[PDB]
Amino acid sequence: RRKVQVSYVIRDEVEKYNRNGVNALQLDPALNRLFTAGRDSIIRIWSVNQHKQDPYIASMEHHTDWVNDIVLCCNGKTLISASSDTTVKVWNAHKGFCMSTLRTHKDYVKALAYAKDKELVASAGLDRQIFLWDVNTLTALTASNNTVTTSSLSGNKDSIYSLAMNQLGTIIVSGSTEKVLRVWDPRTCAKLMKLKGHTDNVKALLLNRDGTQCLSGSSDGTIRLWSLGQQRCIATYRVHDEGVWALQVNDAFTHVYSGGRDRKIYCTDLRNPDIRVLICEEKAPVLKMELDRSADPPPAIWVATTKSTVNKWTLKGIHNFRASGPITPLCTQPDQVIKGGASIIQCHILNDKRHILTKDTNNNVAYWDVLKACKVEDLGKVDFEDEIKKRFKMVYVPNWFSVDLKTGMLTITLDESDCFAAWVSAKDAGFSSPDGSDPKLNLGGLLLQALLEYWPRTHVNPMDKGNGYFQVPPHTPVIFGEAGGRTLFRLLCRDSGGETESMLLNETVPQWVIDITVDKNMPKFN
Numbered sequence: 001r002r003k004v005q006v007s008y009v010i011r012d013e014v015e016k017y018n019r020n021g022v023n024a025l026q027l028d029p030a031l032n033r034l035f036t037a038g039r040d041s042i043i044r045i046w047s048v049n050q051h052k053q054d055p056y057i058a059s060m061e062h063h064t065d066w067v068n069d070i071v072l073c074c075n076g077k078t079l080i081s082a083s084s085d086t087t088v089k090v091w092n093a094h095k096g097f098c099m100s101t102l103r104t105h106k107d108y109v110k111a112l113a114y115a116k117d118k119e120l121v122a123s124a125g126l127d128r129q130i131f132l133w134d135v136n137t138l139t140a141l142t143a144s145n146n147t148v149t150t151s152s153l154s155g156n157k158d159s160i161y162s163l164a165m166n167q168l169g170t171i172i173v174s175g176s177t178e179k180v181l182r183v184w185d186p187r188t189c190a191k192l193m194k195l196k197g198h199t200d201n202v203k204a205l206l207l208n209r210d211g212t213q214c215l216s217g218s219s220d221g222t223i224r225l226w227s228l229g230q231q232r233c234i235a236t237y238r239v240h241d242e243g244v245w246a247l248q249v250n251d252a253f254t255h256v257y258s259g260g261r262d263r264k265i266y267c268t269d270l271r272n273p274d275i276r277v278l279i280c281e282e283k284a285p286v287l288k289m290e291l292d293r294s295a296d297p298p299p300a301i302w303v304a305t306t307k308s309t310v311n312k313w314t315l316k317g318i319h320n321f322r323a324s325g326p327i328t329p330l331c332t333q334p335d336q337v338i339k340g341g342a343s344i345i346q347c348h349i350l351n352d353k354r355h356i357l358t359k360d361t362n363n364n365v366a367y368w369d370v371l372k373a374c375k376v377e378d379l380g381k382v383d384f385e386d387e388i389k390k391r392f393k394m395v396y397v398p399n400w401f402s403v404d405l406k407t408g409m410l411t412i413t414l415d416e417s418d419c420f421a422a423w424v425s426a427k428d429a430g431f432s433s434p435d436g437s438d439p440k441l442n443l444g445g446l447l448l449q450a451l452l453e454y455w456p457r458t459h460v461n462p463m464d465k466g467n468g469y470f471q472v473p474p475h476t477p478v479i480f481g482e483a484g485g486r487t488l489f490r491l492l493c494r495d496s497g498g499e500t501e502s503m504l505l506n507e508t509v510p511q512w513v514i515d516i517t518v519d520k521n522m523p524k525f526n
């Protein structure tokens with residue numbers, strides 16, 4: 001039995017730019033469209049024509065935690081996504097909307113593998129379980145028939161960080177903290193071999209068309225070539241002076257593109273390792289890369305890092321630089337830059353247990369109101385640690401919420417255990433009521449009431465509006481999730497009115513919330 005937590009995000013109606021690093025990239029050459037999977041929990045669509053003042057197309061927001069991987073199938077018609085919210089989501093990629101949500105995984109969904117030819121896709125995570133999926137079966141799901149037959153892969157002892165399938169979908173390999181790679185036949189689900197060789201966790205896997213050989217990059221700093229025939233590591237290339245997290249290959253399976261912690265991007269000739277071209281040196285560790293496959297040799301490479309900015313680097317002059325060459329990079333500046341937003345990297349809950357001070361990646365300090373789920377002031381580039389001090393309030397209020405910053409935005413979480421703990425005077429809370437004054441308001445209560453304001457159940461029946469003090473921004477996402485893991489339901493505050501929304505709120509809203517919002521049984525103060 002898992003308890004349920006109500007959480008919300010303090011953000012704007014629209015987040016045009018990534019508010020954290022990008023985990024996964026997916027390029028549509030047909031429509032010149034890029035897909036960025038964000039740690040900000042939002043997938044975004046961009047136009048990569050190169051000549052446009054603003055490349056922003058749309059943003060897909062259903063996920064409640066990091067978006068770890070994305071897969072663009074059916075000639076760019078469908079998008080499958082993997083998230084730390086424990087779910088896999090099917091999206092109409094052309095029109096940009098959510099279609100189905102697979103809640104089969106019990107923990108973070110870390111990677112996706114794709115068999116272009118057989119139109120198959122697999123998902124693995126910290127579950128230690130891999131799930132195979134037919135894309136056509138997924139594309140025809142949500143309605144009256146949400147019937148899902150789960151085809152799993154067994155063996156993984158540890159948490160999965162990488163997945164790869166060959167074009168034909170005859171081979172499937174997993175990478176984990178077990179250091180060892182496990183191979184299977186995706187069509188039969190049968191175990192093939194268990195390849196031993198790596199020293200650390202494998203964050204990047206790559207397979208050739210026929211699935212005869214596999215390329216792997218591990219946190220040990222090496223790229224390893226494997227023969228699935230010979231059933232072992234046929235070669236080892238030490239390319240990076242630290243962890244290697246992202247790999248890409250040409251169609252020949254001869255030139256490998258790599259990046260990871262050391263920020264350097266390299267093309268390395270597997271045939272002649274001597275030939276190793278430094279494409280560029282990024283401003284943050286490389287998390288994922290996506291080659292432009294419009295031409296052979298690939299004309300450009302799209303690069304995702306720890307930063308919010310996404311870049312394209314031209315590979316146009318490699319061959320000419322290869323014949324004619326203190327390590328000088330091919331590129332110094334990116335060909336195309338997709339702009340990024342700021343991430344809140346430091347936060348301080350003030351002594352009143354209502355105000356929050358934050359510092360972001362641009363060094364901008366800002367004051368926030370948790371209870372009214374909003375920003376209050378932008379203090380600018382003030383000294384943050386001095387600001388924390390300046391704003392010392394000599395008061396005590398019990399902790400009634402937790403804070404997370406894994407999206408680069410403020411996410412507040414309420415738990416049954418301490419949601420109602422903070423009892424403050426109305427005059428104190430800045431809620432002057434002249435002159436039938438100073439009642440003792442419960443902060444967590446009022447906040448819950450404001451969050452579920454548009455829920456009709458919280459008005460009247462009878463069983464024979466708001467909280468009365470404030471309103472939360474109506475676009476405020478209200479998330480319902482198991483404390484242990486699984487995210488249950490995400491809706492906007494303003495959407496609680498809708499009949500199908502209210503129907504879902506009725507099944508997910510836990511009792512501890514029903515008591516105060518619906519039953520109006522406000523807690524007792526002593």
Ligand SMILES: [Au+]
Pocket residue numbers: 073074119135136139
């Ligand atoms: Au398809």
Ligand SMILES: [Au+]
Pocket residue numbers: 062089098099100101
């Ligand atoms: Au959905």
Ligand SMILES: [Au+]
Pocket residue numbers: 197224233235236
């Ligand atoms: Au080796």
Ligand SMILES: [Au+]
Pocket residue numbers: 255267268318
């Ligand atoms: Au190359």
Ligand SMILES: [Au+]
Pocket residue numbers: 255267268269275276277
């Ligand atoms: Au090369």
Ligand SMILES: [Au+]
Pocket residue numbers: 346347348403404405
């Ligand atoms: Au924080």
Ligand SMILES: [Au+]
Pocket residue numbers: 347348349403
């Ligand atoms: Au904090």
